Design a protein around this ligand. Structure first.
Ligand code: MET
Ligand code: SF4
Ligand code: SF4
Lengths: 230, 231
């Protein structure tokens, strides 16, 4: 259990949200989360239901399976969870992706810092809104973004906040106004219920609210391309 | 100086494609295109259908109307056409946007180069595929990207090639392999329900790139503005 807890490896596919939306990438979803958000779409990563399905793999084993699935049709890998920032062992895998000249992306809610953050080309910090029933530690969020700006990583970091209600939108203003020099992405909240027409109505409704708000000018409102496709 | 040929000024809205998709911005559409692409969705910018509807405004007049439409709910302006690169007069309007601390974006096919290219925060070079029946001058395209990489503007330039068939996809490989360092974008072409048809075209384009080894550092995106409001 000294390796990397891997849950699923699939691709190539398109990143459907965030800073690198549309990027063709391979996904390596790891296990473990320090959050228990109310609308966690990947609860199996932390509730223990997929504990038996965990495959503790080394860095070279993950890369070998990435080549058996993606072949040579990928140059970008996305690590997700869960909260992959909880795993310090990922440093060996992120370093392995760099040796093979492969760009790496990762999303974390911003509760724990790792030294290998400086190696991520597309680092997404995603603070969770109050609708998740999670308390946001802005002190730890400050330390992470400050450490990234000191290590000359501003070009690789973005902020993404999912919006389910008007209270989440006010939370996004607090995060955006606190870190003005960081690209800010607003994502539409998904409520599992022709859901494609229901989602474009939710996306357009969020765009209309941001269009009239003067405090959310340097933001990017995006939907989830994956849920619209599949 | 000289007035800027403006066709329409609206916003705030979101950018629906490419380098800064989803970015809230104000659109300032200029007139004049040195191309005549067969599927030009903005034919009125160059065919001469709306010569009377052109307002030759100065840099201060355009910025004044931007504040009347969007007020303080915008910090990003996108210049579209047409081919705004044919207008040297835009240097005054872009400098005015930088003075007011406003980011600027522009998309051009990449024929003519201007000095104010170094002032664009989100510059998109969009070479046209063979389906446009246009001839791509790669010798003239190399000059633009070389000038940007010399003026330390590689962090603000991207390539975007719209795809309608398999022949356009092979043209995107030639452009992507010719400029590896520049971020590359693939966009779905619209035949012009429309929404359910474009998703099938976007899904089909994703499946083709998913098994392609030459188009790896590529972002495949549709037209978001068409999926919400259509034509
Ligand atoms: C759909 S990928 C993201 C899943 C989950 N919201 C996370 O933070 O990892
Ligand atoms: S951070 Fe993501 S994976 Fe973790 S509980 Fe929240 S939604 Fe689920
Ligand atoms: S370059 Fe763009 S605006 Fe100009 S003719 Fe071609 S499609 Fe139309």
């Amino acid at each position: 259990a000294k390796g990397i807890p891997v849950l699923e490896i699939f691709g190539p596919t398109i990143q459907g949200e965030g800073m690198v939306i549309g990027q063709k990438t391979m996904f390596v979803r790891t296990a473990g989360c320090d959050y228990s958000c109310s609308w966690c779409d990947s609860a199996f990563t932390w509730d223990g239901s997929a504990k038996k399905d965990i495959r503790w793999m080394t860095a070279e084993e993950i890369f070998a399976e990435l080549k058996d699935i993606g072949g040579d049709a990928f140059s970008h890998v996305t690590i997700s969870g869960g909260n992959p920032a909880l795993l310090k062992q990922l440093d060996a895998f992120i370093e392995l992706l760099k040796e093979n000249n492969i760009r790496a992306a990762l999303e974390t809610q911003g509760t724990v810092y790792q030294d290998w953050f400086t190696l991520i080309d597309d680092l997404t910090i995603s603070p969770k809104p109050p609708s998740s029933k999670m308390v946001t530690n802005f002190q730890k969020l400050d330390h992470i973004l400050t450490s990234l700006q000191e290590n000359d990583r501003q070009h690789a970091v973005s902020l993404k906040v999912v919006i389910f209600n008007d209270e989440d939108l006010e939370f996004a203003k607090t995060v955006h106004k606190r870190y003005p020099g960081i690209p800010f992405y607003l994502q539409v909240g998904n409520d599992d219920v022709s859901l494609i027409a229901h989602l474009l109505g939710k996306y357009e409704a969020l765009v209309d609210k941001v269009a009239v708000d003067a405090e959310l000018n340097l933001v990017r409102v995006l939907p989830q391309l994956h849920t619209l496709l599949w």
